Amino acid sequence: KVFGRCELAAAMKRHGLDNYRGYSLGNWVCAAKFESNFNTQATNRNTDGSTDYGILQINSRWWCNDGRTPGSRNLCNIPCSALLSSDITASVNCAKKIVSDGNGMNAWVAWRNRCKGTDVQAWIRGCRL
Ligand SMILES: C[C@@H](O)CN1CCN(CC(=O)O)CCN(CC(=O)O)CCN(CC(=O)O)CC1
Ligand SMILES: C[C@@H](O)CN1CCN(CC(=O)O)CCN(CC(=O)O)CCN(CC(=O)O)CC1
Ligand SMILES: [Cl-]
Ligand SMILES: [Cl-]
Ligand SMILES: [Cl-]
Ligand SMILES: [Cl-]
Ligand SMILES: [Gd]
């Protein structure tokens, strides 16, 4: 599924991302835009063999099982393919574990470079929330 901006905001708010570990909702919408273009089916291979999956491009090195990243972990306890579904439940729940692990939202490269220090409220402006 390719989400609209306001559609995704509403979905993310319903699963409790708004102000999760102090990160306002506009930060999450901004990350998803630049990580995946709001597309749940996005995949991207990294140079060490791992792959990033879904709307927030979660990495098979630590977080999910894709059967081909040898010596990895699966700390969200899921197949990487569940992170490509039109329902974002599994992506949101896994992301809650990542952002809590000590590095905050800096784990998402595109957030650090394109969203950090900007007017992030602009990304939910106009939405009926
Ligand atoms: C809870 C998360 O920390 C899981 N974590 C993967 C688990 N392992 C081993 C472990 O963390 O016990 C990898 C070890 N490694 C450095 C280290 O921890 O020493 C990873 C660093 N990051 C995050 C961080 O530590 O900042 C990756 C996420
Ligand atoms: C093996 C190294 O990871 C040693 N580690 C010291 C041992 N402990 C806990 C533990 O690692 O079992 C520290 C707790 N902690 C992070 C965490 O573990 O969750 C501090 C951050 N760093 C590393 C990091 O995690 O990125 C300190 C280095
Ligand atoms: Cl915001
Ligand atoms: Cl694997
Ligand atoms: Cl959803
Ligand atoms: Cl933080
Ligand atoms: Gd770690």
PDB file of all heavy atoms in Angstrom, residues 56-80:
ATOM      1  N   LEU A  56       9.147   1.917   7.432  1.00  0.00           N
ATOM      2  CA  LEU A  56      10.230   2.524   8.175  1.00  0.00           C
ATOM      3  C   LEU A  56      11.561   1.788   8.027  1.00  0.00           C
ATOM      4  O   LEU A  56      12.499   2.020   8.820  1.00  0.00           O
ATOM      5  CB  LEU A  56       9.859   2.697   9.666  1.00  0.00           C
ATOM      6  CG  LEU A  56       8.724   3.659  10.027  1.00  0.00           C
ATOM      7  CD1 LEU A  56       8.184   3.358  11.416  1.00  0.00           C
ATOM      8  CD2 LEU A  56       9.253   5.077   9.976  1.00  0.00           C
ATOM      9  N   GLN A  57      11.668   0.979   6.980  1.00  0.00           N
ATOM     10  CA  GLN A  57      12.916   0.389   6.537  1.00  0.00           C
ATOM     11  C   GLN A  57      13.710  -0.263   7.656  1.00  0.00           C
ATOM     12  O   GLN A  57      14.867   0.065   7.884  1.00  0.00           O
ATOM     13  CB  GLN A  57      13.777   1.431   5.824  1.00  0.00           C
ATOM     14  CG  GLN A  57      13.307   1.852   4.426  1.00  0.00           C
ATOM     15  CD  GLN A  57      13.438   0.749   3.398  1.00  0.00           C
ATOM     16  OE1 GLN A  57      14.509   0.565   2.774  1.00  0.00           O
ATOM     17  NE2 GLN A  57      12.338  -0.009   3.191  1.00  0.00           N
ATOM     18  N   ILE A  58      13.083  -1.212   8.348  1.00  0.00           N
ATOM     19  CA  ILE A  58      13.702  -1.903   9.438  1.00  0.00           C
ATOM     20  C   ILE A  58      14.598  -3.009   8.917  1.00  0.00           C
ATOM     21  O   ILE A  58      14.231  -3.775   8.006  1.00  0.00           O
ATOM     22  CB  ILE A  58      12.606  -2.405  10.392  1.00  0.00           C
ATOM     23  CG1 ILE A  58      11.974  -1.170  11.067  1.00  0.00           C
ATOM     24  CG2 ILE A  58      13.138  -3.415  11.388  1.00  0.00           C
ATOM     25  CD1 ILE A  58      10.562  -1.391  11.551  1.00  0.00           C
ATOM     26  N   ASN A  59      15.772  -3.093   9.542  1.00  0.00           N
ATOM     27  CA  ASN A  59      16.920  -3.879   9.114  1.00  0.00           C
ATOM     28  C   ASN A  59      16.917  -5.351   9.658  1.00  0.00           C
ATOM     29  O   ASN A  59      16.693  -5.593  10.873  1.00  0.00           O
ATOM     30  CB  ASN A  59      18.167  -3.092   9.608  1.00  0.00           C
ATOM     31  CG  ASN A  59      19.458  -3.522   8.942  1.00  0.00           C
ATOM     32  OD1 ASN A  59      19.654  -4.636   8.555  1.00  0.00           O
ATOM     33  ND2 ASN A  59      20.356  -2.597   8.826  1.00  0.00           N
ATOM     34  N   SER A  60      17.165  -6.304   8.745  1.00  0.00           N
ATOM     35  CA  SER A  60      17.231  -7.738   9.015  1.00  0.00           C
ATOM     36  C   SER A  60      18.473  -8.138   9.819  1.00  0.00           C
ATOM     37  O   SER A  60      18.603  -9.259  10.250  1.00  0.00           O
ATOM     38  CB  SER A  60      17.227  -8.514   7.688  1.00  0.00           C
ATOM     39  OG  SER A  60      18.424  -8.238   6.949  1.00  0.00           O
ATOM     40  N   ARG A  61      19.424  -7.240   9.963  1.00  0.00           N
ATOM     41  CA  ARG A  61      20.568  -7.561  10.763  1.00  0.00           C
ATOM     42  C   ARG A  61      20.222  -7.796  12.234  1.00  0.00           C
ATOM     43  O   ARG A  61      20.784  -8.730  12.852  1.00  0.00           O
ATOM     44  CB  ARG A  61      21.617  -6.470  10.660  1.00  0.00           C
ATOM     45  CG  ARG A  61      22.897  -6.831  11.364  1.00  0.00           C
ATOM     46  CD  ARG A  61      23.756  -7.785  10.565  1.00  0.00           C
ATOM     47  NE  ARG A  61      25.025  -7.989  11.244  1.00  0.00           N
ATOM     48  CZ  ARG A  61      25.233  -8.903  12.184  1.00  0.00           C
ATOM     49  NH1 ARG A  61      24.251  -9.698  12.572  1.00  0.00           N
ATOM     50  NH2 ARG A  61      26.426  -9.017  12.740  1.00  0.00           N
ATOM     51  N   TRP A  62      19.342  -6.958  12.801  1.00  0.00           N
ATOM     52  CA  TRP A  62      18.950  -7.083  14.213  1.00  0.00           C
ATOM     53  C   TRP A  62      17.497  -7.445  14.472  1.00  0.00           C
ATOM     54  O   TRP A  62      17.218  -8.006  15.538  1.00  0.00           O
ATOM     55  CB  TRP A  62      19.240  -5.771  15.004  1.00  0.00           C
ATOM     56  CG  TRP A  62      20.633  -5.228  14.823  1.00  0.00           C
ATOM     57  CD1 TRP A  62      20.973  -4.013  14.320  1.00  0.00           C
ATOM     58  CD2 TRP A  62      21.861  -5.885  15.156  1.00  0.00           C
ATOM     59  NE1 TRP A  62      22.343  -3.875  14.300  1.00  0.00           N
ATOM     60  CE2 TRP A  62      22.913  -5.011  14.804  1.00  0.00           C
ATOM     61  CE3 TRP A  62      22.174  -7.129  15.704  1.00  0.00           C
ATOM     62  CZ2 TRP A  62      24.279  -5.345  14.984  1.00  0.00           C
ATOM     63  CZ3 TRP A  62      23.520  -7.478  15.867  1.00  0.00           C
ATOM     64  CH2 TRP A  62      24.562  -6.583  15.510  1.00  0.00           C
ATOM     65  N   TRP A  63      16.567  -7.079  13.582  1.00  0.00           N
ATOM     66  CA  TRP A  63      15.148  -6.920  14.007  1.00  0.00           C
ATOM     67  C   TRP A  63      14.121  -7.963  13.526  1.00  0.00           C
ATOM     68  O   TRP A  63      13.095  -8.183  14.166  1.00  0.00           O
ATOM     69  CB  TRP A  63      14.672  -5.486  13.679  1.00  0.00           C
ATOM     70  CG  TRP A  63      15.591  -4.424  14.254  1.00  0.00           C
ATOM     71  CD1 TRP A  63      16.434  -3.594  13.554  1.00  0.00           C
ATOM     72  CD2 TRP A  63      15.750  -4.072  15.638  1.00  0.00           C
ATOM     73  NE1 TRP A  63      17.124  -2.791  14.415  1.00  0.00           N
ATOM     74  CE2 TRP A  63      16.741  -3.068  15.700  1.00  0.00           C
ATOM     75  CE3 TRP A  63      15.192  -4.543  16.825  1.00  0.00           C
ATOM     76  CZ2 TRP A  63      17.129  -2.469  16.897  1.00  0.00           C
ATOM     77  CZ3 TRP A  63      15.582  -3.924  18.053  1.00  0.00           C
ATOM     78  CH2 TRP A  63      16.552  -2.940  18.063  1.00  0.00           C
ATOM     79  N   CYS A  64      14.362  -8.556  12.375  1.00  0.00           N
ATOM     80  CA  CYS A  64      13.428  -9.508  11.775  1.00  0.00           C
ATOM     81  C   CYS A  64      14.168 -10.649  11.072  1.00  0.00           C
ATOM     82  O   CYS A  64      15.352 -10.537  10.783  1.00  0.00           O
ATOM     83  CB  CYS A  64      12.504  -8.755  10.803  1.00  0.00           C
ATOM     84  SG  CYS A  64      13.280  -7.965   9.354  1.00  0.00           S
ATOM     85  N   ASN A  65      13.467 -11.746  10.782  1.00  0.00           N
ATOM     86  CA  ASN A  65      14.100 -12.902  10.102  1.00  0.00           C
ATOM     87  C   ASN A  65      13.772 -12.975   8.606  1.00  0.00           C
ATOM     88  O   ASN A  65      12.595 -13.037   8.225  1.00  0.00           O
ATOM     89  CB  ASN A  65      13.647 -14.217  10.790  1.00  0.00           C
ATOM     90  CG  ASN A  65      14.148 -15.439  10.067  1.00  0.00           C
ATOM     91  OD1 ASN A  65      13.382 -16.326   9.719  1.00  0.00           O
ATOM     92  ND2 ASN A  65      15.434 -15.491   9.832  1.00  0.00           N
ATOM     93  N   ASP A  66      14.770 -12.913   7.746  1.00  0.00           N
ATOM     94  CA  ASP A  66      14.503 -13.069   6.285  1.00  0.00           C
ATOM     95  C   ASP A  66      15.163 -14.260   5.653  1.00  0.00           C
ATOM     96  O   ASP A  66      15.088 -14.453   4.420  1.00  0.00           O
ATOM     97  CB  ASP A  66      14.790 -11.796   5.454  1.00  0.00           C
ATOM     98  CG  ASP A  66      16.280 -11.456   5.345  1.00  0.00           C
ATOM     99  OD1 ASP A  66      17.180 -12.251   5.744  1.00  0.00           O
ATOM    100  OD2 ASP A  66      16.563 -10.376   4.815  1.00  0.00           O
ATOM    101  N   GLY A  67      15.801 -15.063   6.494  1.00  0.00           N
ATOM    102  CA  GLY A  67      16.331 -16.355   6.085  1.00  0.00           C
ATOM    103  C   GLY A  67      17.619 -16.299   5.297  1.00  0.00           C
ATOM    104  O   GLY A  67      18.073 -17.315   4.782  1.00  0.00           O
ATOM    105  N   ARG A  68      18.201 -15.116   5.171  1.00  0.00           N
ATOM    106  CA  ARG A  68      19.358 -14.960   4.336  1.00  0.00           C
ATOM    107  C   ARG A  68      20.399 -13.989   4.858  1.00  0.00           C
ATOM    108  O   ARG A  68      21.247 -13.545   4.096  1.00  0.00           O
ATOM    109  CB  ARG A  68      18.926 -14.550   2.922  1.00  0.00           C
ATOM    110  CG  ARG A  68      18.376 -13.142   2.774  1.00  0.00           C
ATOM    111  CD  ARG A  68      18.437 -12.741   1.312  1.00  0.00           C
ATOM    112  NE  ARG A  68      18.297 -11.300   1.078  1.00  0.00           N
ATOM    113  CZ  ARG A  68      17.919 -10.748  -0.091  1.00  0.00           C
ATOM    114  NH1 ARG A  68      17.680 -11.526  -1.144  1.00  0.00           N
ATOM    115  NH2 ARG A  68      17.832  -9.399  -0.236  1.00  0.00           N
ATOM    116  N   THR A  69      20.340 -13.627   6.129  1.00  0.00           N
ATOM    117  CA  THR A  69      21.304 -12.666   6.713  1.00  0.00           C
ATOM    118  C   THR A  69      22.005 -13.485   7.820  1.00  0.00           C
ATOM    119  O   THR A  69      21.531 -13.580   8.957  1.00  0.00           O
ATOM    120  CB  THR A  69      20.599 -11.397   7.268  1.00  0.00           C
ATOM    121  OG1 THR A  69      19.713 -10.869   6.278  1.00  0.00           O
ATOM    122  CG2 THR A  69      21.629 -10.343   7.660  1.00  0.00           C
ATOM    123  N   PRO A  70      23.104 -14.139   7.463  1.00  0.00           N
ATOM    124  CA  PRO A  70      23.572 -15.175   8.386  1.00  0.00           C
ATOM    125  C   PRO A  70      24.145 -14.561   9.662  1.00  0.00           C
ATOM    126  O   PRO A  70      24.757 -13.479   9.651  1.00  0.00           O
ATOM    127  CB  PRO A  70      24.613 -15.977   7.561  1.00  0.00           C
ATOM    128  CG  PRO A  70      24.578 -15.408   6.169  1.00  0.00           C
ATOM    129  CD  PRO A  70      23.921 -14.051   6.237  1.00  0.00           C
ATOM    130  N   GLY A  71      23.880 -15.225  10.775  1.00  0.00           N
ATOM    131  CA  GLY A  71      24.345 -14.743  12.063  1.00  0.00           C
ATOM    132  C   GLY A  71      23.642 -13.468  12.502  1.00  0.00           C
ATOM    133  O   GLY A  71      24.220 -12.682  13.212  1.00  0.00           O
ATOM    134  N   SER A  72      22.396 -13.254  12.071  1.00  0.00           N
ATOM    135  CA  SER A  72      21.637 -12.101  12.517  1.00  0.00           C
ATOM    136  C   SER A  72      20.755 -12.461  13.710  1.00  0.00           C
ATOM    137  O   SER A  72      20.668 -13.586  14.120  1.00  0.00           O
ATOM    138  CB  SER A  72      20.776 -11.582  11.384  1.00  0.00           C
ATOM    139  OG  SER A  72      19.994 -12.603  10.876  1.00  0.00           O
ATOM    140  N   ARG A  73      20.109 -11.453  14.257  1.00  0.00           N
ATOM    141  CA  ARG A  73      19.116 -11.647  15.268  1.00  0.00           C
ATOM    142  C   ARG A  73      17.775 -11.272  14.671  1.00  0.00           C
ATOM    143  O   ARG A  73      17.678 -10.672  13.585  1.00  0.00           O
ATOM    144  CB  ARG A  73      19.440 -10.758  16.463  1.00  0.00           C
ATOM    145  CG  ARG A  73      20.845 -10.970  17.046  1.00  0.00           C
ATOM    146  CD  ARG A  73      21.002 -10.089  18.281  1.00  0.00           C
ATOM    147  NE  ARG A  73      22.167 -10.386  19.116  1.00  0.00           N
ATOM    148  CZ  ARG A  73      22.107 -10.646  20.421  1.00  0.00           C
ATOM    149  NH1 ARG A  73      20.942 -10.669  21.043  1.00  0.00           N
ATOM    150  NH2 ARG A  73      23.216 -10.878  21.109  1.00  0.00           N
ATOM    151  N   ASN A  74      16.761 -11.591  15.438  1.00  0.00           N
ATOM    152  CA  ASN A  74      15.374 -11.336  15.157  1.00  0.00           C
ATOM    153  C   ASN A  74      14.772 -10.792  16.464  1.00  0.00           C
ATOM    154  O   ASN A  74      13.949 -11.437  17.081  1.00  0.00           O
ATOM    155  CB  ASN A  74      14.721 -12.677  14.790  1.00  0.00           C
ATOM    156  CG  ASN A  74      13.250 -12.562  14.459  1.00  0.00           C
ATOM    157  OD1 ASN A  74      12.736 -11.474  14.218  1.00  0.00           O
ATOM    158  ND2 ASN A  74      12.567 -13.704  14.415  1.00  0.00           N
ATOM    159  N   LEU A  75      15.165  -9.594  16.882  1.00  0.00           N
ATOM    160  CA  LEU A  75      14.668  -9.067  18.152  1.00  0.00           C
ATOM    161  C   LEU A  75      13.199  -8.613  18.170  1.00  0.00           C
ATOM    162  O   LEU A  75      12.649  -8.442  19.258  1.00  0.00           O
ATOM    163  CB  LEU A  75      15.581  -7.971  18.682  1.00  0.00           C
ATOM    164  CG  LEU A  75      16.972  -8.453  19.169  1.00  0.00           C
ATOM    165  CD1 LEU A  75      17.885  -7.248  19.211  1.00  0.00           C
ATOM    166  CD2 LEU A  75      16.934  -9.097  20.563  1.00  0.00           C
ATOM    167  N   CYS A  76      12.547  -8.414  17.009  1.00  0.00           N
ATOM    168  CA  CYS A  76      11.093  -8.171  17.030  1.00  0.00           C
ATOM    169  C   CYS A  76      10.277  -9.465  16.917  1.00  0.00           C
ATOM    170  O   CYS A  76       9.052  -9.422  16.913  1.00  0.00           O
ATOM    171  CB  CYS A  76      10.687  -7.093  15.997  1.00  0.00           C
ATOM    172  SG  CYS A  76      11.397  -5.446  16.365  1.00  0.00           S
ATOM    173  N   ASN A  77      10.945 -10.612  16.838  1.00  0.00           N
ATOM    174  CA  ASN A  77      10.272 -11.910  16.764  1.00  0.00           C
ATOM    175  C   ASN A  77       9.246 -12.106  15.581  1.00  0.00           C
ATOM    176  O   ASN A  77       8.163 -12.681  15.755  1.00  0.00           O
ATOM    177  CB  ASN A  77       9.599 -12.203  18.108  1.00  0.00           C
ATOM    178  CG  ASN A  77       9.399 -13.687  18.346  1.00  0.00           C
ATOM    179  OD1 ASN A  77       8.488 -14.107  19.091  1.00  0.00           O
ATOM    180  ND2 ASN A  77      10.260 -14.499  17.725  1.00  0.00           N
ATOM    181  N   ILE A  78       9.630 -11.648  14.380  1.00  0.00           N
ATOM    182  CA  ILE A  78       8.749 -11.663  13.212  1.00  0.00           C
ATOM    183  C   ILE A  78       9.521 -11.993  11.931  1.00  0.00           C
ATOM    184  O   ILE A  78      10.731 -11.686  11.819  1.00  0.00           O
ATOM    185  CB  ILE A  78       8.089 -10.283  12.957  1.00  0.00           C
ATOM    186  CG1 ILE A  78       9.127  -9.144  13.015  1.00  0.00           C
ATOM    187  CG2 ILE A  78       6.906 -10.066  13.900  1.00  0.00           C
ATOM    188  CD1 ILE A  78       8.597  -7.771  12.636  1.00  0.00           C
ATOM    189  N   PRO A  79       8.808 -12.546  10.931  1.00  0.00           N
ATOM    190  CA  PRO A  79       9.390 -12.607   9.578  1.00  0.00           C
ATOM    191  C   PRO A  79       9.426 -11.202   8.937  1.00  0.00           C
ATOM    192  O   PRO A  79       8.519 -10.377   9.141  1.00  0.00           O
ATOM    193  CB  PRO A  79       8.495 -13.617   8.822  1.00  0.00           C
ATOM    194  CG  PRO A  79       7.410 -14.009   9.779  1.00  0.00           C
ATOM    195  CD  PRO A  79       7.461 -13.144  11.002  1.00  0.00           C
ATOM    196  N   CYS A  80      10.513 -10.901   8.224  1.00  0.00           N
ATOM    197  CA  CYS A  80      10.671  -9.567   7.635  1.00  0.00           C
ATOM    198  C   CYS A  80       9.516  -9.246   6.700  1.00  0.00           C
ATOM    199  O   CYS A  80       9.147  -8.069   6.541  1.00  0.00           O
ATOM    200  CB  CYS A  80      12.014  -9.400   6.909  1.00  0.00           C
ATOM    201  SG  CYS A  80      13.484  -9.517   7.958  1.00  0.00           S
TER     202      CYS A  80
END
